[PDB]
Amino acid sequence: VLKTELCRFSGAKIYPGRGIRFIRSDSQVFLFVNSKCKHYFHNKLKPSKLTWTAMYRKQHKK
Template sequence: MPTVRQCSFCGHEIPPGTGLMFVKNDGTILWFCSSKCRKSMLKYHRDPKKFKWTTKYLKVK
């Protein structure tokens, strides 16, 4: 059974056969569901807690 991975940025599940893999210099493997998530983390260094479309978003009262 294929492993269902979670996007390293937004936390959504990535269907098998899709997604983007990225290996960091220290050997950590990151998976992204889309180039939007990949850019957000690697290019813009965004915090997923601040974006409503991620599962890591923290609601501030």
Template sequence: MMACLSQYDNLFNSIPRLLANDYVTREGMATLATLNVLGKAKGYPVWGAPNRVEPFMNEKSPPPVACPSIVNSKALGFPVSKLTELCRFSGTKIYPGKGIRFVCSDSQVFLFANSKCKRYFHNRLKPTWTAMYRKRHKKDIAAETVKKRRRTSVCM
């Protein structure tokens, strides 16, 4: 065992469990990473059944003498939710951890995809380049192809 971790012999029993409401939380992933580091420091093997995680989550049973794999949450069998939000200006998808959040003085929250969207919104410029504007004002490509003029042939 590493000298710096020798004082944490009972840490496995004091760490909170992994899941909350059937979704992976940041605390759960941090717990999983801590269990992995401590298990490797104690010389435990990696848990052989990545889809069977109930020994790590059951509070009544002691944790197994193994360290969980933290390769990804799918390998552990956890359901992962990717909640995407839409940009209030351009309508593009914004994934968690991305985007710029702006709160007005009236507590209204705006989420922008990038600084260009934020700048155009604050300067009150028209979003003519965005997909949402083009769809709303019927500027899509399919409409342009229908409106093409047809040449009439002249017979003499």
């Protein structure tokens, strides 16, 4: 079975051979599925506030 990671921002599944990995100053590791999630993360947008993210849907019981 393939090992797939999850996007820290959107929760999307990341398949092998791609992904953007950001190391925060506090040694936290963030995997982004694409530059859309990367930009919104660095713009300080909260996933809970974006309707399409998995975090929003889990908190709203979608």
